[PDB]
């Protein structure tokens, strides 16, 4: 309850979402790769963190 109520909620999956977004931030992202990355991030978020398809999505994102 301390972890969630404090305001850190939704911080889950940030290591695979926020860190990569920052990694792309310094890069001048073209539109094509930008939209591809957005789609891949959405697929990663939808998929469970502990499945093989999620691992493949994470590998492609990296």
């Amino acid at each position: 309850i301390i972890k969630k109520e404090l305001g850190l909620e939704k911080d889950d999956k940030d290591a695979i979402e926020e860190k990569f977004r920052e990694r792309l931030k310094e890069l001048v992202v073209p539109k094509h790769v930008m939209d591809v990355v957005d789609e891949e991030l959405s697929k990663l978020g939808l998929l469970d963190n502990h499945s093989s398809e999620f691992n493949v999505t994470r590998n492609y994102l990296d």
Partner: protein, 62 residues
């Protein structure tokens, strides 16, 4: 590029039933039409269910 998408849209408009396009070429994941049993975390239904939901009608022009 013979306006197949555009002509399909025009016939959908003329026939008065709601329009919706669907790309299947190159697809391999049959789950995109079947989704998953919903036991998986974040599982989503087949794309046809989404099409019906978005179209809001039971007789669209797929």
């Amino acid at each position: 590029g013979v306006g197949k998408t555009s002509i399909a849209r025009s016939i959908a408009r003329a026939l008065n039933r709601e329009y919706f396009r669907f790309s299947v070429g190159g697809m391999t994941d049959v789950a995109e039409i079947k989704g998953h049993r919903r036991t998986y975390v974040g599982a989503m239904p087949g794309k046809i269910i989404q099409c019906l939901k978005k179209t809001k009608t039971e007789n669209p022009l797929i």
